[PDB]
Design a protein around this ligand. Structure first.
Ligand SMILES: O=c1[nH]c(=O)c2nn[nH]c2[nH]1
Ligand SMILES: O=c1[nH]c(=O)c2nn[nH]c2[nH]1
Ligand SMILES: O=c1[nH]c(=O)c2nn[nH]c2[nH]1
Ligand SMILES: O=c1[nH]c(=O)c2nn[nH]c2[nH]1
Ligand SMILES: [Ar]
Ligand SMILES: [Ar]
Ligand SMILES: [Ar]
Ligand SMILES: [Ar]
Ligand code: NA
Ligand code: NA
Ligand code: NA
Ligand code: NA
Lengths: 295, 295, 295, 295
């Protein structure tokens, strides 16, 4: 037997950082969950019980807190690139670092119409994520994402003209509920190293904001022919607005809301045009994916 | 052996309702999870296998959807009172109905600064809940609550002057992070029946909004001496603003953020005045409760 | 305003303890999650910012680890009673301690048909729980429970003869699937104090084992007329076997498995006697409770 | 813009099947959660709102229940291969089916030392999984796995001789707790099609049982030098026992149990040789992976 692939490190490292402006008194908080996995010349830890090649996972955890102390933690694309670069520069035998960051929302509170200097609310479990792969001699590959964005529209969704055969019971419809949890990933052009990531820093927050805005507006305004057709329109607009993105990937569940036939009870009308009360279905769910790139 | 207490019914009934304004084209959605448990002269179903006394839980589920079709589902205090009253009026041998409703957020989307007519976002897992107990000859008891409101302040929290003995390691502090998940319940005066609940309908949404606003403002502005002292100030203000509330109960976890001593690494200063990077603790957590009523 | 009720303490305290037999080399592990909440003369911490009455929740956490170091942690009824008694004896102004313990399974591994001296497996998320209320001058009240015991029988469950009216769609059946998650609680006679709890120590593990065995055998062997009727038979047998129990409470969800009509597809027969493939329903679920006590 | 990749289908399809032996009266239940995603000539559903290429996800769901009615559902490697093959044979424009199955435990109850004919218990959240990729002209690729197997050993784990630098605080140890949740995957040789999968049917259950037994015995008996070294010994033995496996992948969290220094309290000794009470850590956790293949 041989080791074909190996990676190890620390998962679920919770980090909070506060920035205090001495001038204004305004405080800004950042909270993330970090995972760092390393690869390199470590096979002998598996095959020969040779721990001399292991950077302890406890040390990786210490490194994350030290790196957060000495560097900006925003945008997460930059923090992840700094953290990944650290390992491949510090350790001769480590050739790849894989950094995953989940950013949690702490939104400044408005009290009496004024932004509060040091009070925050978690307005939704929506996340902003980054996956950073730092590979010796191959640069920095960054995938940015938003996830956990849960939306619903109560009309202006259709689904008709699909394949009908002896397995088909679904009725065609010209008016349904559409609800999903949005997972959207944009993959950046390969960066040569940290200097190039630093040169593009302003584009990271702006592209996240554009991806979010395009997703919400397209969902709200599209008279949707299908999840497939609406998600393609989203991906096409993101690629049009940011030339440094190579691909956009959406993964969308179709969270079903079923009509309830109440006609058995006193002829109550609750289907088609008369549908008011629906049963949200926990499972099963449609799952629709696509990856859109340049011609 | 004897049956000392018995209740049964249907839990986890998901309901969606849409309201369509024909004039404006504007649609409003409501989504809830409902539980109905009944009590009454049902002991023989347990002791003698006498199913003749059982209103099937499947029928309770049907009743919830029919009631939602024929009645307003907002405010939830009113819907729960209608649903509970139904069972004790329809079934001679049912003497109490217990209705629990969890209301899920569907917040209208703003697209290009305008409210969208039919598109919604789940802005946070915060819930608005109601517990309604309808008891034959004893009226309607309503407990209203908000839950899952997650907040953090990065300064203006203290904790000193507590009991110190041979079990104590905690250092006194004049500047810490305070973060909690707010669970707040207000208990209404007993109502004689549905006519009296209907007479107070406007107070339900207004009191929920006041409870939320008082919680957020007091949390943000109090230079907190303890969770205990801040939560009492919240409860006292709610009771002052709504005379039809008898009691206010808060249940608050103290979600700890620990300083990280980095002085072992190149004398890095990250404690006290120099604290920037903290470790959020998943467990354990402080849990602080109180119930505040009138003199 | 006045404080009507107040309790505070530490939740989610994870504890592991190992016992090492020097003779045999055999090791036994215990893992629990503990919550301790205190009550007493503490109103001024809420009303006057008087922290002098507060035993810090951090100190409660330290106390749990010290108590586990110096005492047996099994049976949990005894450990909880020791821990609760500690607070009301140590602190003059604390008059009640509320101790909740969840015990996690670590079952010794069998390797090559022999019990392993120091290797364990988590065989199911079933828990053994205790709730201990220690109240100055009122003794020790103990509720013991098992929870998370998930069972299914594929036949020998019926449900017919229930109330039928204009809300009813459910068909009567003489052969269905019955599946539940068992939550069973037995409430002990009030104990005068720790000496009396110690005098009954052997009864705690034996009664837990009897409750489990009676639940499993009755579920498996009863040709069930309803959840109501089967759960009553369980409670009646537990009360018959342990005279120091006052009440037994069961809380049982009815986890529905629905027939799937496939007759639309090539006349496939999959209902009634021909039912082979079913759709487990995640929600909604029946919820059936009862409390059984002595004549 | 262009579609670079697309797949869609139905997730979270819960299925139960019962087998009834008329001779013996013995019933056997199977419960799974199924996901089917399709790929093929479907780009126009995304780009042109052309639904004519879409096999509705609702139809995929119907197909899973019909396939379960007409075929064995065990071993899951066979069921997944039948289900995947169906789509690429039935639909000219579908060129790949991706089938994921999670099998839930329903273990026959022993009542009074005898196996019960129709009563089952969920003994742990351990799963048996299959991933089946059926690709037109490329055969059937099967990955089998077990997941959610949670184990702990209280001694006979060491970790010393790792890299020490200015980021390192971890002390070397010759005696620690080791606890993990095992995720183990074995990848079969490519199969030409369903006839070849059928020819190997007996090997699927036997290899699952061998993988489980090797994992448990190696964990229990290895005087572990590291997670890395113990997991390699597991993978090497599985590959030795089944020639039709190409690779074995383990993914193991290192679930930390920390010593608690109690020496501040009356000189209590609870570290090193005197360690009895530990604090299980929920996060962070080590994460160790490896893939082992043939020379
Ligand atoms: O078994 C282990 N492997 C590691 O890589 C490691 N790092 N810290 N502790 C550890 N334990
Ligand atoms: O056992 C049951 N009890 C009930 O109360 C019930 N109601 N519907 N189905 C049911 N099954
Ligand atoms: O606000 C607080 N209240 C308490 O009771 C406490 N105990 N430890 N820390 C604490 N903080
Ligand atoms: O938008 C949809 N896409 C699909 O692929 C589908 N299948 N069933 N319903 C559906 N809705
Ligand atoms: Ar969509
Ligand atoms: Ar608070
Ligand atoms: Ar039952
Ligand atoms: Ar291991
Ligand atoms: Na390197
Ligand atoms: Na009545
Ligand atoms: Na006392
Ligand atoms: Na094909």
């Amino acid at each position: 037997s041989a080791v074909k692939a190996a990676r190890y490190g620390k998962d679920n490292v919770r980090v909070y950082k506060v920035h205090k402006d001495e001038k204004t008194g305004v405080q800004t908080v950042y909270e993330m969950t970090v995972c760092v996995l390393l690869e390199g010349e470590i096979e002998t830890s598996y095959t020969k019980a040779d721990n001399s090649v292991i950077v302890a996972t406890d040390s990786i955890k210490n490194t994350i807190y030290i790196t957060a102390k000495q560097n900006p933690v925003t945008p997460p694309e930059l923090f992840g690139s700094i953290l990944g670069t650290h390992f491949i520069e510090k350790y001769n035998h480590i050739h790849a670092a894989h950094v995953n960051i989940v950013c949690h929302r702490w939104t400044r509170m408005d009290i009496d119409g004024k932004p509060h200097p040091h009070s925050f609310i978690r307005d939704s479990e929506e996340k902003r994520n980054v996956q950073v792969d730092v590979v010796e001699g191959k640069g920095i590959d960054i995938k940015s994402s938003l996830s956990g964005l849960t939306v619903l529209k109560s009309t202006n969704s259709q689904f008709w003209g699909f394949l009908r055969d002896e397995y088909t019971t679904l009725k065609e419809t010209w008016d349904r509920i559409l609800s999903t949890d949005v997972d959207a990933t944009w993959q950046w052009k390969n960066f040569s190293g940290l200097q190039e990531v630093r040169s593009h820093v302003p584009k990271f927050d702006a592209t996240w904001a554009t991806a979010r805005e395009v997703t919400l507006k397209t969902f709200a305004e599209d008279n949707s022919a299908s999840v497939q057709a609406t998600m393609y329109k989203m991906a096409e607009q993101i690629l049009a607005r940011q030339q440094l993105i190579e691909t956009v990937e959406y993964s969308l569940p179709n969270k079903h809301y079923f009509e309830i036939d109440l006609s058995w009870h006193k002829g109550l009308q609750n289907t088609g045009k008369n549908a008011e009360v629906f049963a949200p279905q926990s499972d099963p769910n449609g799952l629709i994916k696509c990856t859109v790139g340049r011609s």
